[PDB]
Amino acid sequence: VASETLKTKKMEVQIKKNFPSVLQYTMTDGKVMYGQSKDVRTVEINGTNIELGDDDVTFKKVSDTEATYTLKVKDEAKKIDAVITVQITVKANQLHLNVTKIKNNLSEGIPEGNGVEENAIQTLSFPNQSLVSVRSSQENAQFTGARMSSNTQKPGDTNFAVTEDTNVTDSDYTYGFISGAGLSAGLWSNSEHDGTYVAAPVRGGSQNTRVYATTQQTGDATSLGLASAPWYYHRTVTDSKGKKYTVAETALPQMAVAIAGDENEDGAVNWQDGAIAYRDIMNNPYKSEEVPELVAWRIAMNFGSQAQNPFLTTLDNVKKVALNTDGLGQSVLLKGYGNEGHDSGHPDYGDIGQRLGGADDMNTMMEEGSKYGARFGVHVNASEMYPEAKAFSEDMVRRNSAGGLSYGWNWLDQGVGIDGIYDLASGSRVSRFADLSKEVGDNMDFIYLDVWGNLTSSGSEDSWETRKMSKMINDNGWRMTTEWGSGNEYDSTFQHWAADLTYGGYTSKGENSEVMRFLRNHQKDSWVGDYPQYGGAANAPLLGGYNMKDFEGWQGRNDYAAYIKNLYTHDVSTKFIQHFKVTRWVNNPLLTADNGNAAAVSDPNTNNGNEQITLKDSNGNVVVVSRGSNDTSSAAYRQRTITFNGVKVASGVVSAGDGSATGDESYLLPWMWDSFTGKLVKDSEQKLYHWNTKGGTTTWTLPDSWKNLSSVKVYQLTDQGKTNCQTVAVSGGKVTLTADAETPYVVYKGCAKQIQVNWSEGMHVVDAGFNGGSNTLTCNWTVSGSGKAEVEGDNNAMLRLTGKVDVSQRLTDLKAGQKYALYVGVDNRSTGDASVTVTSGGKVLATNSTGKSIAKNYIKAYGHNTNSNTENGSSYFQNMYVFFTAPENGDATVTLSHKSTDGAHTYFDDVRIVENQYSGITYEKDGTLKSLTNGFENNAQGIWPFVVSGSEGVEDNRIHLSELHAPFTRAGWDVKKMDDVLDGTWSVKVNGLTQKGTLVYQTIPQNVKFEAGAKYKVSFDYQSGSDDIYAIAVGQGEYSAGSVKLTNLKKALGETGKAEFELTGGCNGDSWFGIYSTATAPDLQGSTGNAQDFGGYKDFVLDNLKIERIESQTRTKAEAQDKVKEIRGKYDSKRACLSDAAWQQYQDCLVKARVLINKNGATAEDFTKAYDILVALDEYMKKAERKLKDLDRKLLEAARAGQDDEVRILMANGACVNAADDVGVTPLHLAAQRGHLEIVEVLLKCGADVNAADLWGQTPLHLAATAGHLEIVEVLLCNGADVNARDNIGHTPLHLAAWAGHLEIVEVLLKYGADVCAQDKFGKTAFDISIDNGNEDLAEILQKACKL
Ligand SMILES: [Mn+2]
Ligand SMILES: [Mn+2]
Ligand SMILES: [Mn+2]
Ligand SMILES: [Mn+2]
């Protein structure tokens, strides 16, 4: 065959002129690797194999390093007529084969707007091209392949000898390496082909197989050759509506080989040698070079309009983590960066959350954060959308084969599936990422793509789609990261289900492959880390593996100390290991003959035949990681030694990644790199991180550059940075370190300066989050008063106040004349007021207060929810607001204060000053509320003046600010029957919180204070899905069932309703109103499936809140005094059956009214207030009385029935023991006559009046004696029953027991002391009763009382 030679300094490649084929590679040393030794001239186009003849190919040697081929590819019958241009180039030990041009003689190209290109060239390949091959006739001929596996128990690798029996045909792999006759090679291709995988729960580029292995007979030997899998060129796709499109290539077809000798110099030639060479030709994920610097990964979360984490708070948190890690690199994923938060506004990528501070604050956070080595990225979704999103349209909607919506998940709103193919082919998604690019410029590091590969956008989401998705992202300068462990093998640098080891179990983690991890460990956080309960790959991997925790609200995670502890336990050593590239990996226990890995490398002269990995950097530094034993039953299987240039830098067992068992690992890791591009730092900046799991004393050999030092400087790392400095002597290049358990230390050669941190930049105050330690109360905040101010809490630090104290700070950078809202988180445990005040000079611009906090925090993503223990195992943190105009003098000051001298605490956190246009609060002259209006158009955050209640416990609450996007958010679009927005752009929305039987949301006194005794007109616009499913709740103090006044609301589905009521302020100033979920089932109107959710039959929308104080009729002192008499005359006699707290509330109220009435110099205003407070007290006591009368009537009913359980349930729920009806019959009377001994004894123990009588003068003893209940009569006399008690006739329980003729009951009561002299109105004794009836048996016991 006629050939030509391409030359480099490393090899000579003999190539055929009749086809782009290699005959052989001859290296400088004379070693040879074969190409395609046979006459194979096949080209596949659209699945049709065409064999080329001599006249179908033209050749041209361009230079000594390049040749060009022109391929005439025609099949008239199969509609193929193409001209393919192939380039072969050589450099060093690499050969590249590129398709540089594709000409189609059967088309004019792709029609405008990605229209269908008829006879388009969709696929292209060179079947059995064998660019590199090995033969069974060669010394140590072998194949090594890798396929995708997310399963910890199933490796993705194959390792086998190439023999005469080896028979393969287009066997597809992610990676493929052939070795033989002292040379090795891997084949790289940019093919987007999807094929064979070991294990993956999703698509989304998990199945990308780019190499094809095929055997052929090469004379008397079997030859195994490598070819590229097919490439896509102009691919024709169909969307959910049946519309077809043709989309151009992501890139032109490209492939390469890199010929290796014994690269790691270990005396053998295998895939590892090929893998070292392969790194020079392989694709590298965009920005994969920064991956080793990303030590601190975490999520900063925002959800449901709450603004739990505004961008400038996230920046303070970056500075806290920077101090605690001594400036290690960070990667913060902003989950809910856009619109109203997480799983809101998808897919509006360019809509940055206005309530977080918008694009302005996001850019400030990214720009400033980068100075601390912190990278930022956003969570996006390209599979699900909500009606509120501006991108929402009929074209975007994914539809099923029947024409209906492809529904997603319902939570805040109903998610609808995005038509993935439409989104790509129309240029829609690329334009939405462009919207984001305009907002962030070049400040943002990465994109985090959620759910991609789970088939929500289409049944495909293949490697071709994922390749195009990753390109749109990389094109904007963004690093690619995604959700699923197996997803996007080609371009992703991080998988959430790989780095967060807790999710999905052992079958759904990161990439379980020795080949993939050997090649790319340093480029991704997509592997298997320690999580021993999964076993296999997850049991102490030598390379570690990212273990991700959070503290900023993601899944309620708000534990900072655990976050930091975990960074040092797993992530510091994982990241240190990623600064080196794998060069050798022997004795892998996961690979056996049974799982298809008989030829896997097994050296008994390395680490006793146990697992070992060697890694190297471009500076010749060597890292060696060794496993103690390859037996999982041995204690040494989890033992790992790490050496750096032959010196031990880490030893022992890590604390289990699943949090199940603490370890003993200690390390002294040299951190030689900067937190930016990872370049080597200078000598004065070189440092060592020290960690000791169990704590104690360890001795280490310092690195070579430290061997002549006399001493080192050791600093303990905290949330304040470098503390407790120690000078440690160096003897013979060694150091002894004493360490507390699980405590980070940093070692320097000399004195090291503290990292400079200016807290709360752009926040208008210094240290708004109280992160500056105790010192913050000295030069940032000024403290005054007899009381005390402390920075308290070992997690999220807060300001704690006790006694009479004020904490002040000057406000900076305010725009003169502009409107601002200032809010602060407040938890008040004191009865004394806690306040927030803005002053200019001395003048008060705005002020607000809270008494004892009455509402617990149920916001899961928030830093101080009721699961975080602010004090006493609870948290009452709620945002307290002030609205003011920035003064013209530019002098403004905030003051946080506690007024009373009591010892109870008040907590404050997160002082937020934000530009805000809300102006719906009007006051009276005395500073009390005149009116409050809200259309929710200018809310700084949350559902203010309401606060979320406990209907779902601590949750990502299904309550938020709904957004207008007509016609989609309106009633009538699809199966939707309710409007999301009543008027304007925003309303308050509740999604499906039906049949809870509890409070959903409520006002609190710090948001809307209802003055004691004052009357208010409350009105709002609403939309409710069904009749009586939701109600208006009115209460005083902390919500409690039974104490609440409920008004059921009627159905207002698609048509806005009006709600109006009057509210009278409770005596303690703690009155409130809200929305309550009843027990009543919604009317789903015959809807099925998602239509029950989307319809709105179970939802509640509120808007246009209006609260107005109603003027009261003026009262005199006489009127108020008389009202005191009336109230006392009604309730003074009702102390017995009334709670000890209810009697206290009543007494406190009477005291309050008397103080107003009797003050020297009291006015009409005081007399009106005193009278009104008593009127409010009356209605409160009366409502409580009807609820007690309800319980009493049910207790008298259960006394008759005889059920102890329902008698005890009612008594425990507050039932009156001595409760009598219209005829004066108590439950002790009823239980005694029926004879329920278990109830009689329960009632007597509870304090029931044993002497109690009805309108007939009958006591429970009279009733029990006539009925003849011996056991009941016994216990009554033992509890103090009146033995000689009489009725309206004069019958003692002796007379009645004789009338009924009870032989055993008469004798029992006589023994105790029942009178025999007793006579009724007729003057009849027991002598007359015994002689009247036909039985003389009674006359025998009476003649044994007195003998006649
Ligand atoms: Mn080797
Ligand atoms: Mn804080
Ligand atoms: Mn509105
Ligand atoms: Mn919404």
Short mmCIF file of C-alpha atoms in Angstrom, two decimals, residues 98-102 121-122 124 188-192 230-235 247-255 283 463-464 467-468 471 475 490-491:
data_model
loop_
_atom_site.label_atom_id
_atom_site.label_comp_id
_atom_site.label_asym_id
_atom_site.label_seq_id
_atom_site.Cartn_x
_atom_site.Cartn_y
_atom_site.Cartn_z
CA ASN A 98 -10.08 16.01 12.71
CA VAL A 99 -13.02 16.40 10.32
CA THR A 100 -12.32 20.02 9.25
CA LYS A 101 -15.15 20.28 6.66
CA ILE A 102 -18.41 18.47 5.74
CA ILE A 121 -25.80 14.50 7.66
CA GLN A 122 -26.89 13.59 11.23
CA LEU A 124 -20.66 10.25 11.05
CA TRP A 188 -9.90 10.47 22.91
CA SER A 189 -12.95 11.65 20.94
CA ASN A 190 -15.44 14.53 21.32
CA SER A 191 -18.28 12.09 20.26
CA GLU A 192 -21.65 12.75 21.97
CA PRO A 230 -20.20 8.17 16.10
CA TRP A 231 -20.23 12.01 16.03
CA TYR A 232 -23.36 14.13 15.57
CA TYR A 233 -23.21 16.78 12.82
CA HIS A 234 -26.59 18.26 11.74
CA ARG A 235 -29.03 16.41 14.04
CA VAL A 247 -29.57 21.91 14.92
CA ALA A 248 -25.91 22.45 13.87
CA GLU A 249 -22.94 20.60 15.46
CA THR A 250 -21.74 21.52 19.00
CA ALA A 251 -18.21 21.22 17.52
CA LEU A 252 -16.79 19.50 14.41
CA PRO A 253 -15.71 15.79 14.79
CA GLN A 254 -12.33 15.44 16.58
CA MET A 255 -10.33 12.49 17.96
CA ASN A 283 -10.87 17.51 26.91
CA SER A 463 -25.09 13.71 26.00
CA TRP A 464 -25.73 15.79 22.81
CA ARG A 467 -23.03 19.04 25.65
CA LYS A 468 -24.99 22.01 24.17
CA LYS A 471 -21.50 25.05 26.07
CA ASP A 475 -19.56 30.43 26.77
CA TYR A 490 -17.77 15.49 29.77
CA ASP A 491 -18.16 18.96 31.33
#
